[PDB]
Design an enzyme around this catalytic site. Structure first.
Site, PDB file in Angstrom:
ATOM      1  N   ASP A  68       0.854  -1.197   0.000  1.00 27.98           N
ATOM      2  CA  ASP A  68       0.000   0.000   0.000  1.00 27.98           C
ATOM      3  C   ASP A  68       0.891   1.250   0.000  1.00 27.98           C
ATOM      4  OD1 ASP A  68      -2.271   1.741   0.202  1.00 27.98           O
ATOM      5  OD2 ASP A  68      -2.116   1.746   2.395  1.00 27.98           O
ATOM      6  N   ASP A  74       8.188   3.301  -8.165  1.00 27.53           N
ATOM      7  CA  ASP A  74       8.861   4.498  -8.663  1.00 27.53           C
ATOM      8  C   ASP A  74      10.178   4.753  -7.962  1.00 27.53           C
ATOM      9  OD1 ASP A  74       5.819   4.792  -8.925  1.00 27.53           O
ATOM     10  OD2 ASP A  74       6.584   6.347 -10.304  1.00 27.53           O
ATOM     11  N   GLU A  97      13.012  12.504 -13.648  1.00 31.16           N
ATOM     12  CA  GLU A  97      11.633  12.925 -13.603  1.00 31.16           C
ATOM     13  C   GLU A  97      11.202  13.047 -12.151  1.00 31.16           C
ATOM     14  OE1 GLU A  97       8.473  11.791 -12.803  1.00 31.16           O
ATOM     15  OE2 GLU A  97       7.164  12.612 -14.366  1.00 31.16           O
ATOM     16  N   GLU A  98      11.486  11.990 -11.394  1.00 31.30           N
ATOM     17  CA  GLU A  98      11.110  11.901  -9.989  1.00 31.30           C
ATOM     18  C   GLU A  98      11.909  12.747  -9.021  1.00 31.30           C
ATOM     19  OE1 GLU A  98       8.443  10.019  -7.818  1.00 31.30           O
ATOM     20  OE2 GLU A  98       7.742  10.913  -9.724  1.00 31.30           O
ATOM     21  N   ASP A 118      13.586   9.116 -16.835  1.00 37.98           N
ATOM     22  CA  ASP A 118      12.273   8.961 -16.222  1.00 37.98           C
ATOM     23  C   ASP A 118      12.399   7.506 -15.779  1.00 37.98           C
ATOM     24  OD1 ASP A 118       9.593   8.984 -15.524  1.00 37.98           O
ATOM     25  OD2 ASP A 118       8.896   8.674 -17.591  1.00 37.98           O
ATOM     26  N   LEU A 120      10.444   5.251 -13.945  1.00 41.89           N
ATOM     27  CA  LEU A 120       9.303   4.431 -14.335  1.00 41.89           C
ATOM     28  C   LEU A 120       8.264   5.337 -14.936  1.00 41.89           C
ATOM     29  CD1 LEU A 120       8.942   1.461 -14.391  1.00 41.89           C
ATOM     30  CD2 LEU A 120       7.546   1.615 -12.387  1.00 41.89           C
ATOM     31  N   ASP A 121       7.945   5.022 -16.175  1.00 40.43           N
ATOM     32  CA  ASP A 121       6.985   5.778 -16.941  1.00 40.43           C
ATOM     33  C   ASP A 121       5.674   5.056 -16.926  1.00 40.43           C
ATOM     34  OD1 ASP A 121       6.213   7.879 -18.895  1.00 40.43           O
ATOM     35  OD2 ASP A 121       5.883   6.092 -20.197  1.00 40.43           O
ATOM     36  N   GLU A 280      11.576  12.702 -21.831  1.00 45.12           N
ATOM     37  CA  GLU A 280      10.376  12.047 -22.355  1.00 45.12           C
ATOM     38  C   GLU A 280      10.353  12.364 -23.826  1.00 45.12           C
ATOM     39  OE1 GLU A 280       6.806  13.378 -20.081  1.00 45.12           O
ATOM     40  OE2 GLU A 280       7.117  11.510 -19.014  1.00 45.12           O
TER      41      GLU A 280
HETATM   42  O1  LIG Z   1      -3.280  11.271 -22.161  1.00 39.76           O
HETATM   43  P1  LIG Z   1      -3.242  11.322 -20.657  1.00 39.76           P
HETATM   44  O2  LIG Z   1      -4.613  10.796 -20.216  1.00 39.76           O
HETATM   45  O3  LIG Z   1      -3.125  12.735 -20.160  1.00 39.76           O
HETATM   46  O4  LIG Z   1      -1.978  10.521 -20.106  1.00 39.76           O
HETATM   47  C1  LIG Z   1      -0.859  10.067 -21.000  1.00 39.76           C
HETATM   48  C2  LIG Z   1       0.563  10.280 -20.569  1.00 39.76           C
HETATM   49  O5  LIG Z   1       0.913  10.131 -19.139  1.00 39.76           O
HETATM   50  C3  LIG Z   1       2.295  10.083 -18.981  1.00 39.76           C
HETATM   51  O6  LIG Z   1       2.616   9.343 -17.813  1.00 39.76           O
HETATM   52  C4  LIG Z   1       2.969  11.476 -18.870  1.00 39.76           C
HETATM   53  O7  LIG Z   1       4.382  11.430 -18.695  1.00 39.76           O
HETATM   54  C5  LIG Z   1       2.701   9.356 -20.286  1.00 39.76           C
HETATM   55  O8  LIG Z   1       3.267   8.095 -20.055  1.00 39.76           O
HETATM   56  C6  LIG Z   1       1.467   9.184 -21.156  1.00 39.76           C
HETATM   57  O9  LIG Z   1       1.726   9.057 -22.563  1.00 39.76           O
HETATM   58 MN   LIG Z   2       6.838   9.904 -17.706  1.00 39.35          MN
END
Ligand SMILES: O=P(O)(O)OC[C@H]1O[C@](O)(CO)[C@@H](O)[C@@H]1O
Ligand SMILES: [Mn+2]
Ligand SMILES: Nc1ncnc2c1ncn2[C@@H]1O[C@H](COP(=O)(O)O)[C@@H](O)[C@H]1O
Ligand SMILES: Nc1ncnc2c1ncn2[C@@H]1O[C@H](COP(=O)(O)O)[C@@H](O)[C@H]1O
Ligand SMILES: Nc1ncnc2c1ncn2[C@@H]1O[C@H](COP(=O)(O)O)[C@@H](O)[C@H]1O
Ligand SMILES: Nc1ncnc2c1ncn2[C@@H]1O[C@H](COP(=O)(O)O)[C@@H](O)[C@H]1O
Ligand SMILES: O=P(O)(O)OC[C@H]1O[C@](O)(CO)[C@@H](O)[C@@H]1O
Ligand SMILES: O=P(O)(O)OC[C@H]1O[C@](O)(CO)[C@@H](O)[C@@H]1O
Ligand SMILES: O=P(O)(O)OC[C@H]1O[C@](O)(CO)[C@@H](O)[C@@H]1O
Ligand SMILES: [Mn+2]
Ligand SMILES: [Mn+2]
Ligand SMILES: [Mn+2]
Lengths: 337, 337, 337, 337
Positions: A68, A74, A97-98, A118, A120-121, A280
């Site tokens: 949890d 991440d 990113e983090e 990044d 974990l994406d 990204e």
């Molecule tokens: O289109 P949404 O609903 O805003 O989310 C998409 C995007 O979210 C992310 O985590 C932003 O970095 C990408 O992996 C992804 O392509």
């Molecule tokens: Mn990302």
């Protein structure tokens, strides 16, 4: 190449990275960095498939483990990458990113390479077990001053190597450098990435558009027009099949393989887009380019943008060159002062 | 209940299934079926993770080519399932998508349950490392005559157990039977499915619609009118997010977990929908209804349809309940004559 | 070394081999070779734990697979090693236990390194699931003539690197070079060998003798005396605990860790011993030496022997220096003309 | 039998056990026990393969140290077994070597079977990657009173199931129960034990004796006289080979498969042998007798001994039958008064 006899060859990432560096005639500072990434990717893959998930759930008696608000994927990822990377003795600045601020590697372990990533994406969308990935971009420190956060701030055009690791139904590591884009795949049984695809180039035109259509209400007119054209085609050909996984790595990757186009335009909420430039957009833009495709912000081009914030966002449209050409013109048509 | 604070221990599938059959004094012929089917899944996951690809690319030197038979994934899968199935001594009629006819288990291995499966959904969407899965629906033979295709032709309402395994960033197994839906996570390290989510109930109302808008052109009004109300809500409320992985298991799975709805209705190129009833439609429907949502086709419910042919197709609309009843209304508002 | 702050380091074989080579300032021809071995070891480990054993036994329907006189572990091993090694582009001559003649690498893939190996050791005793291993020794081609079988024929003293891979209850790769003996261990989850032991040196004296006592009847008098002394000690101290796994890698390795001594003397049947010089004795002798122990034939010393047959056997006694000193004197006492 | 040429298909443990309990209409409480115990084994194998060591050595950056509790192998093993055991709802009294007292399962999880195990035999011989194992003997509770230590004190003749898992170059599980001994191989790739050897029967006469000759000094004449007849056969026939891995599971296992005998008799430092009866002696004995050999102590048979204490010790001699009856004779020839 031309002619010979019996040649059955198995190219493993490590071998490749090794050979490639020797041709480059470089010292090996990079090759180290490249291998350190290789190891981060595999360890993260293991975490992502929830290997050992049994211990957290009482096999060992539910000791002190609980799923949890405890050990999140991440942080762990960011921990590994930053760890495994500093110890490569090849990096002087990590922009993740983090992590809010640019990490400046302690002199004992310094290297002449900046790495933007990044960990974990799409990590949010892991509960739905959907495909997540790791993206990275490497720049060479072109300054002389103490590695300041500034060293990250370089147009993607300045990348020395970039790529991403997809943790889909199978794990793929896509690597791109000056001379080409190569896809290596993990054989988990032996912990090795085998070259399954060499010199990947993308289809001129595709038949898939990838976009979160739910923002229709706030999309700009040029986009609205492009999409309608895919749905209801003028010349009466086949409409474009649509796709939207909701994970950048999964969409970019499918775009790179079957072709088609990806888009994540500007809309009021994120009039600068959602996706980040340094770790990204840029690395993905760079891959698309080396693959023979195009990555544009709609008006300019991703890689020529010159950053001012390590965390700055940017719109991004990338895919088959012919499709992205089509959308660029439609932007021209509407473009004005 | 007597005394047990916030507690939780390891619970494997095997143990789980096992006690379930004890509870309802089954002869234990079905336990052997869920047991077998599961072993099949576990193994397929592995073939799907392209684990062992190394040898296949010359690392072991494909002498004159090698392998214990590991070819087209959907073909080997198809085999594996039909195999651990016959040998369960619990099946009489097996129906596979990859099979033009129904399989009628020889008298030696001849059990009593009719089993319908789609050995590898997304089989083509595989090259993109985009999640694939396996779907299976179980029927109790109801007749006196020789088992045959007709024993497979029973409406979904007569299912006894149903589920699907999803091969994504994790391997998950979802099993629904009279009591409810229970999700088991595969901990690869020790090769066992662990109970992570017990008695899953779906969101009454999600924030995500799912559909191939590539077909907007061929969309019947109700659908077309519904999609609109999500993109541009009448009551000026926040619009729905969209997500279409282009793989039923992944989308049905996302919809089960995160809420929302999933649509694959009829069109100009597919008057009866593209999805096959017996092995894709009913299972997801059963899981859905047992999770707390609905699975309509537009005018009638998936589970009641009486099958005229084993490879019959059907349009489907499943998801959160408040969401599926909204589209139904719209479908009623556009009465057909 | 002396002083600093926060240093949490994870040394992976590949990293080590990489660093070590850079210090050596060598081109990387070796480092390639060293990595190619690294990969052979891991793939063989997988074969040894019979991963995929299920396919051979009908999971896939017992297709064309059968366990008896079909795909044997030895051949497969020898296939891999020779394959994975030629493709390293670093070897010009492979002398293997399982291959009668010295393999001469095709010019396209030639390298300046000779590699002598025993693909699977103790492979006979795998039915009893007892510990087997892979041994290897690398020499640098010091000739000028076309790589002839002769190039293998060099005293072990000429080795440039040697070591063995133990596939026991866990997999260990022991590597030895000029500067030291280092033990790396395989973490199967991520396919990586981690340095778990650095600069291994062996105990001066031990408390275990390893020998097949069943040959007592044919042992030479010097040996007979040594053994009796371990069993019934003169000065009345503790007798030596005995061990004999029946697999060279397992015994040598335990000798290297707990100390003690190993022996495989000459007896009439094998008056030249059973163990081979080039790819059993020598590589093990070399490790013992770099560890601070001794490898003697009883009269001379293993590494100074100059081969005349690539398959020649040799007696061998190796272990803690103080124990092996004790047995060498007893040989002196009895030695004569 | 009716018609089936040279045939053979996949048979998992789970399926195997399952039908066995069906055959003898058990309530299915024991199936749940063999089921549970097995899951324990499978997991322990993994901890024993030091799989996951990477993270433990800083690759994941031991933040302030980490883990879901993975410490002393025998300690975690001990835990794991006692855990999946209580939760089987099939045990009332658990007896562990690592435990000074008997464990008496609380009324909630309280089953009916008394279970004796040695969670990790060879636990100390581990550093050498030398095979280790797990041994378990099952007793049916026979009383009316409250379960307690006395319910564990029943001679081996009253065992219901017994076996041991050996972690070596492969993970093997041997299960003996009334009908016979059946060996299951763990195919790690898919995490399932596969039936490889069914109804194992031992060699009437092998060519290998096994014993710690380090103790020759403290050997009782019969033993001492027997060893001699093997080294230097009276009838000038080929001498016996010797092999002593120094780990009961490995030696008992080698003796089961390849034939031969195994001795761990009394001596000056251990008047009653070193091996513990309840969890090492009886199981091996049961397996042995069910395999076709004998398990004597010198004068009486292991299985008949009546235990005065749970951690009782006993000398043991087991192996091929013709071999164990030869030593017995010698033991009779040297009558004691
Ligand atoms: O289109 P949404 O609903 O805003 O989310 C998409 C995007 O979210 C992310 O985590 C932003 O970095 C990408 O992996 C992804 O392509
Ligand atoms: Mn990302
Ligand atoms: N593994 C590699 N693949 C491609 N180019 C490399 C590689 N290693 C080194 N090079 C090139 O040579 C430069 C100098 O290498 P280095 O000394 O290791 O920093 C690198 O920045 C690259 O541009
Ligand atoms: N493991 C189980 N889980 C749920 N229902 C079961 C189970 N085992 C048996 N049953 C129910 O009882 C019936 C008898 O099972 P069986 O005799 O084993 O074929 C089945 O048709 C199921 O409806
Ligand atoms: N990985 C390494 N470890 C130790 N020494 C090395 C290594 N790589 C190269 N060297 C040394 O330098 C020599 C020349 O390296 P090379 O050009 O690669 O053949 C080798 O034979 C070694 O003696
Ligand atoms: N799976 C099985 N294998 C062998 N004997 C079994 C099995 N299951 C039950 N039995 C026998 O039948 C008895 C009743 O089993 P149970 O009711 O499940 O506790 C046990 O004590 C065993 O002797
Ligand atoms: O690309 P389309 O035409 O929208 O269809 C994708 C569909 O294919 C299938 O895999 C068919 O089994 C569906 O599960 C999936 O949603
Ligand atoms: O002592 P024995 O019974 O002759 O066999 C032992 C030897 O066999 C071998 O396979 C010979 O290479 C070695 O692994 C081992 O040490
Ligand atoms: O070294 P020793 O004294 O001969 O005893 C080794 C014995 O230790 C044990 O592991 C004790 O559990 C036995 O299984 C094994 O054979
Ligand atoms: Mn399908
Ligand atoms: Mn050998
Ligand atoms: Mn023990």
């Amino acid at each position: 190449t031309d002619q010979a006899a019996f040649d059955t060859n198995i190219v493993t990432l490590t071998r490749f990275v090794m050979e490639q560096g020797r041709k480059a005639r470089g010292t090996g500072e990079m090759t180290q960095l490249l291998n350190s990434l290789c190891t981060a990717v595999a360890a993260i893959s293991t975490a992502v498939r929830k290997a050992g998930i049994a211990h957290l759930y009482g096999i060992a008696g539910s000791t002190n483990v609980t799923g949890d608000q405890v050990k999140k994927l991440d942080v762990l990822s960011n921990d590994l990458v930053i760890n495994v990377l500093k110890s490569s003795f090849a990096t002087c600045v990590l922009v993740t990113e983090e992590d809010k601020n640019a990490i400046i590697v302690e002199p004992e372990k310094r290297g002449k390479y900046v790495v933007c990533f990044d960990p974990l994406d799409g990590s949010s969308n892991i509960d739905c077990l959907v495909s997540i990935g790791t993206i990275f971009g490497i720049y060479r420190k072109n300054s002389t001053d103490e590695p300041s956060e500034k060293d990250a701030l370089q147009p993607g055009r300045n990348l020395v190597a970039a790529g991403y690791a997809l943790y889909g139904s199978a794990t793929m590591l896509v690597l791109a450098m000056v001379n080409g884009v190569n896809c290596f795949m993990l054989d988990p049984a032996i912990g090795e990435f085998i070259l399954v695809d060499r010199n990947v180039k993308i289809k001129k035109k595709g038949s898939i558009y990838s976009i979160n259509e739910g923002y229709a209400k706030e999309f700009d007119p040029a986009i609205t027009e492009y999409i309608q054209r895919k749905k209801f085609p003028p010349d009466n050909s086949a409409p474009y099949g649509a796709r939207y996984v909701g994970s950048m790595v999964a969409d970019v990757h499918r775009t790179l393989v079957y072709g088609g186009i990806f888009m994540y335009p500007a809309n009021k909420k994120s009039p600068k887009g959602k996706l980040r430039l340094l770790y990204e957009c840029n690395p993905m833009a760079y891959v698309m380019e080396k693959a023979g495709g195009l990555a544009t912000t709609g008006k300019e081009a991703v890689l020529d943008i010159v950053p001012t914030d390590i965390h700055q966002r940017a719109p991004i449209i990338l895919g088959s060159p012919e499709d992205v050409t089509e959308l660029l013109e439609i932007y021209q048509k509407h473009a004005a002062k």
